[PDB]
């Protein structure tokens, strides 16, 4: 019986160039021996990091998923994998006496990044409203879903990956929706809740060079 943790070497991971904080953290792996190489063992790894610990003193309830692809020797570079929202805030949005509208579009960027976006909006109770209802008709819900569909479709296909990610750092899609969709029914709680990777193109190292400087 010997300690397996004496054969562990600490690594470093670096965020892409859209993030102000460069160092994310440290990970460890077994020392390489023969057939299995430590570079392959860090191939599929996903880290669940928050935005407030990655960009600046921004909001703290948005989480990002990052996956490494290559190692330069005690130094790993990652690329964007997905975006998801923190659970407590998301279930604090949902309360009784209001309706929530969901949408989902498979849209892709100018390169081979096939995305899957989810947006949720909540109806606003007015300031002088006496009625506890704050309800909406079904055709208004369909129109709001169609408008959110067009908004989160339009701001994707003319943009590359970096500009989409820099758009995702604030809630600019949500503000643009609640400015655009308030002619039908006013909304107070609008954000994009989930972005997924479905298909990934070929890995060539030029993007991983220019996305980290």
């Amino acid at each position: 019986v010997v300690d397996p943790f004496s054969k562990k070497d600490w690594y470093d991971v670096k965020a892409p160039a859209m993030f102000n904080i460069r160092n994310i953290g440290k990970t460890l792996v077994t020392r390489t021996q023969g057939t299995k190489i430590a570079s392959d063992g860090l191939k599929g790894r996903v880290f669940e990091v928050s935005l407030a610990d990655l960009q600046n003193d921004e909001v703290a309830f948005r989480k990002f998923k990052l996956i490494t692809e290559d190692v330069q020797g005690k130094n790993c570079l990652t690329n964007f994998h997905g975006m998801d929202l923190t659970r407590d805030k998301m279930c604090s949005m949902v309360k009784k006496w209001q309706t929530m509208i969901e949408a989902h579009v498979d849209v892709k960027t100018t390169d081979g990044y096939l995305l899957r976006l989810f947006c949720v909006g909540f109806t606003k109770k007015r300031n002088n409203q006496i009625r506890k209802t704050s309800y909406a008709q079904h055709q208004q819900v369909r129109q709001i879903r169609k408008k959110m569909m067009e908004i989160m479709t339009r701001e994707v296909q003319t943009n590359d990956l970096k500009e989409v990610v820099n758009k995702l750092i604030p809630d600019s899609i949500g503000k643009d929706i609640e400015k655009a969709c308030q002619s039908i029914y006013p909304l107070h709680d609008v954000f994009v809740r989930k972005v997924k990777m479905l298909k990934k193109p070929k890995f060539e190292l030029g993007k991983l060079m220019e996305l980290h400087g």
Partner: protein, 136 residues
């Protein structure tokens, strides 16, 4: 066991999954990705009585043991990820997480971002039992 890191200026982050049910507690600590473990001790490690292995005292003892292991190995900061049984059984965390969090904080282990990550179903399959439930 030896590494070139800065102690006074910065800190090392890992994550710790605390799964607490009404039958057992799980204090499991991994790296930031969650792929690679650090140490895993459970409520059956400290008490040999099968009556109360989800007791707060057993979870406290397991949390102090894994805190001592992370201190001797060189992990200083932890991101708490809380978990219940999940599925269709229950959503309330078990009676070990409340003592486990306080025992992890009391040992000198710095705490970052705490979160509840439990499997929530969107109307999954049928719960165990009859239509009338378990009559006791």
């Amino acid at each position: 066991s030896l590494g070139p890191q800065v102690a006074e200026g910065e800190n090392v982050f890992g994550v710790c999954h605390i799964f607490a049910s009404f039958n057992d507690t799980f204090v499991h600590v991994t790296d930031l990705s969650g792929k690679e473990t650090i140490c895993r001790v459970t409520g059956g490690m400290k008490v040999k009585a099968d009556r109360d292995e989800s007791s707060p005292y057993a979870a406290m003892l397991a949390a102090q043991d894994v805190a001592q292991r992370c201190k001797e190995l060189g992990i200083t900061a932890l991101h708490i990820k809380l978990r219940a049984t999940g599925g269709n059984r229950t959503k309330t965390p078990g009676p070990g997480a409340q003592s486990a969090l306080r025992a992890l904080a009391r040992s000198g282990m710095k705490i970052g971002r705490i979160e509840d990550v439990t499997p929530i179903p969107s109307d999954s399959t049928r719960r165990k039992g009859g239509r009338r439930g378990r009559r006791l």
